[PDB]
Structure 1
Amino acid sequence: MENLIGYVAAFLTTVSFLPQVLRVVMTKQTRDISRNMYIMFFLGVVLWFVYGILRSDLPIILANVVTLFFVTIILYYKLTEG
């Protein structure tokens, strides 16, 4: 049950960026998105990923590796003339 809530919470925050990734490319707008947010966020999951390794905490390990991918795509789009 500990594990169930971890992987569902992990799924939730991770796949939450997908509607955001989609919105960016379909609407071609990043204007309202904060650069400072995703930048600050990008370093966080990296430190979260390391924390999870040192913690042997898998739901946060899995969550942060996939979230990094999602966040890097939104970050990329925002960084290029947005």
Structure 2
Amino acid sequence: DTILLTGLFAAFFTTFAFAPQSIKTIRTRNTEGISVVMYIMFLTGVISWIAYGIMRSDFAVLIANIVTLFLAAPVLVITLINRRKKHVLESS
């Protein structure tokens, strides 16, 4: 109870601290400085964390990175789309 309470408090603060910038970026679609490669690595760690949570039976590390997956994944997808739009625009 004490351990899980502490972890959920740790969870909440880590994933939701900089979440407004992810949400803002998704809405605004301003991916001008975003690194595609740096997000790929980040997401690789995230999916792995989910797997690590399943193995160790840890709710906190599971729920945290599952949410952090869903906040970062669209940012990566949108960033890739914007670059693709740049490729076609430059090609024209």
TM-score by length of structure 1 reads: 0.82
Higher relative contact order, structure no. (Cα contacts within 8 Å, ≥ 6 residues apart): 1
* Residues in 1 aligned to 2:27 and 2:63: alpha-carbon distance in whole angstroms: 27
Unaligned runs of 5+ residues in structure 2 are 84-92
Which structure is larger by alpha-carbon Rg, 1 or 2?
A: 2
2:7 paired residue number: 6
Runs of 4+ in 1 over 4 A off after TM superposition: none
* Residues in 1 aligned to 2:71 and 2:24: alpha-carbon distance in whole angstroms: 13
TM-score by length of structure 2 reads: 0.75
Report how many aligned residue pairs link the two structures: 82
1:23 paired residue number: 24
Unaligned runs of 5+ residues in structure 1 are none
Deviation at 1:18, TM superposition (A): 2.9
